[PDB]
């Protein structure tokens, strides 16, 4: 999405579709490379009472 | 013949009088887990791991010390037996240090093996562990008493086999320490064999320390030539 309008129009006519809506090259819409730190939850066996392994 | 009939998991078997529950279960083929019991030492019964359940009885009995009688059915795989084992080993591992990567017993530790077998899968202990002061008993046996579980195989070996009578327990409660109470060297003919009969890594071999690991060593059965005993 940097080409001039003439090239985009000729490209859309030659392809037969609209390529500006769906571009195969990624841009600023992708997720950021840095993320806030997560807090993964625990499972169902992380309990202090009624957690006998034999059951 | 004075053999009497007992039952292990419903299976009938003959036993001699005076037989313990552990020996009867071994004769059937079941190995009850144990820490303080030894077939060549006196019965102490101070670890409570071998607590097995006799049916039609509202208490668990110590299989390493209970003598069997006629008509007993022993349940070695019931629910309350496993509950008792899990509770006892949770208590055992409550104060054990996190020393497994820096331990020579790792890979051949009895505590690790029965923790995987009969123990639980997580720890509910949210308190602070204890720390026992180390001792010196010679340049053969390396002593780390933080890892000792007070099984008293030391005292029984030094009192009934080596005949030294120089090892004991000083203290009362959670601060009871197995040692010698003075700077005394445990020098004897059979002073290394305690390293064989320590279920934890409390007593290790000082020349062997920090050298190899039990899973990568090949075992070759051979004969000693150092004396004429063979
Ligand atoms: S004695 Fe066993 S449980 Fe204790 S630190 Fe060593 S390997 Fe781990
Ligand atoms: S040092 Fe080992 S053999 Fe000695 S009493 Fe402690 S656990 Fe038992
Ligand atoms: S093995 Fe019986 S109480 Fe320790
Ligand atoms: K040992």
């Amino acid at each position: 999405a940097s080409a001039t309008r003439l090239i985009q129009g000729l490209r859309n006519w030659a392809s037969g579709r609209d390529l500006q809506a769906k571009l195969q090259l990624r841009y600023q819409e992708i997720s950021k490379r840095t993320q806030p730190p997560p807090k993964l939850p625990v499972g169902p066996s992380h309990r202090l009472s009624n957690n006998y392994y034999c059951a | 013949s004075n053999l009497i009939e007992v039952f292990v998991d419903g299976q009938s078997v003959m036993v001699e009088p005076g037989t313990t529950v552990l020996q009867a279960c071994e004769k059937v083929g079941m190995q009850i887990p144990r820490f303080c019991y030894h077939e060549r030492l006196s019965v102490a019964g101070n670890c409570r791991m071998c607590l097995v359940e006799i049916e039609k009885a509202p208490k668990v009995v110590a299989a390493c010390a209970m003598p069997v009688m006629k008509g007993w059915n022993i349940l070695t795989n019931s629910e309350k037996t496993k509950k008792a084992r899990e509770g006892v080993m949770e208590f055992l591992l409550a104060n054990h240090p996190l020393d497994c990567p820096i331990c020579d017993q790792g890979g051949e530790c009895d505590l690790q093996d029965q923790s995987m077998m009969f123990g639980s899968d997580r720890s509910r202990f949210l308190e602070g562990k204890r720390a026992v002061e180390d001792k010196n008993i010679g340049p053969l046996v390396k002593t780390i008493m933080t890892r000792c579980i007070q099984c008293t195989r030391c005292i029984r070996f030094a009192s009934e086999i080596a005949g030294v009578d120089d090892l004991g327990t000083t203290g009362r409660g959670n601060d009871m320490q197995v040692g010698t109470y003075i700077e005394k060297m445990f020098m004897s003919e059979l002073s290394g064999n305690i390293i064989d009969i320590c279920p934890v890594g409390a007593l290790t071999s000082k020349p062997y320390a920090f050298t190899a690991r039990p899973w990568e060593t090949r075992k070759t059965e051979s004969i000693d030539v150092m004396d004429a005993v063979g």
Side-chain angles (χ1 to χ4, degrees), chain A residues 45-55, chain B residues 79 82-83 86-87 119-122 124 126:
Chain A
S45 303
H46 276 92
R47 270 171 304 109
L48 290 99
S49 63
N50 214 6
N51 215 323
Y52 273 115
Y53 192 79
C54 38
Chain B
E79 181 84 35
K82 295 193 283 193
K83 288 194 187 298
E86 287 175 11
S120 183
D121 50 347
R122 45 214 54 209
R124 318 180 308 186
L126 307 173

Side-chain angles (χ1 to χ4, degrees), chain B:
Chain B
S1 68
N2 309 333
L3 293 97
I4 58 176
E5 187 193 21
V6 286
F7 300 95
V8 172
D9 310 327
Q11 178 66 30
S12 174
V13 80
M14 272 316 98
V15 286
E16 285 261 27
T19 314
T20 49
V21 190
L22 199 135
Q23 289 165 348
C25 291
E26 186 260 358
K27 277 177 61 68
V28 178
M30 203 270 173
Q31 193 191 21
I32 302 199
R34 90 281 313 252
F35 274 114
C36 57
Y37 180 77
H38 218 312
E39 54 172 347
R40 303 204 196 269
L41 298 167
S42 59
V43 166
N46 51 7
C47 89
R48 314 306 290 182
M49 181 85 158
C50 75
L51 287 180
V52 78
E53 168 208 358
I54 308 301
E55 82 159 337
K56 297 174 284 187
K59 205 163 185 177
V60 281
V61 297
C64 80
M66 202 49 205
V68 298
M69 334 161 264
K70 191 191 255 156
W72 257 16
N73 192 9
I74 306 146
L75 303 180
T76 62
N77 211 2
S78 73
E79 181 84 35
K80 69 193 299 180
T81 297
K82 295 193 283 193
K83 288 194 187 298
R85 284 173 188 164
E86 287 175 11
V88 161
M89 181 94 97
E90 185 165 5
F91 283 144
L92 261 162
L93 284 178
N95 267 298
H96 204 71
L98 267 80
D99 276 334
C100 287
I102 44 172
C103 199
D104 293 325
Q105 213 72 23
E108 56 189 359
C109 179
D110 227 6
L111 188 64
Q112 285 185 353
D113 283 334
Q114 324 148 70
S115 171
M116 281 285 278
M117 279 331 140
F118 317 100
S120 183
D121 50 347
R122 45 214 54 209
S123 183
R124 318 180 308 186
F125 197 77
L126 307 173
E127 303 289 330
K129 306 176 183 289
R130 82 198 177 198
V132 196
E133 168 183 344
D134 293 338
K135 281 96 175 175
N136 195 4
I137 52 173
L140 282 188
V141 186
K142 169 181 280 187
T143 286
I144 301 172
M145 281 315 158
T146 319
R147 303 165 190 176
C148 170
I149 65 169
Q150 289 95 19
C151 92
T152 71
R153 277 170 169 184
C154 279
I155 299 104
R156 291 178 288 165
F157 184 79
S159 169
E160 308 172 16
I161 296 180
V164 190
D165 275 319
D166 276 338
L167 269 160
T169 89
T170 56
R172 194 182 73 184
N174 211 358
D175 46 1
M176 163 178 102
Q177 316 185 3
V178 172
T180 57
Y181 188 72
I182 35 167
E183 197 259 295
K184 191 179 211 116
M185 256 177 232
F186 188 65
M187 272 329 178
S188 176
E189 294 320 313
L190 306 98
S191 70
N193 295 326
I194 44 181
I195 311 160
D196 287 330
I197 56 177
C198 185
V200 295
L203 299 182
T204 58
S205 170
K206 193 183 258 84
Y208 182 67
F210 313 144
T211 54
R213 277 303 210 172
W215 58 72
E216 63 165 352
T217 58
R218 307 167 192 267
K219 283 98 85 171
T220 306
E221 311 190 359
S222 171
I223 315 297
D224 183 29
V225 306
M226 272 315 327
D227 44 2
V229 191

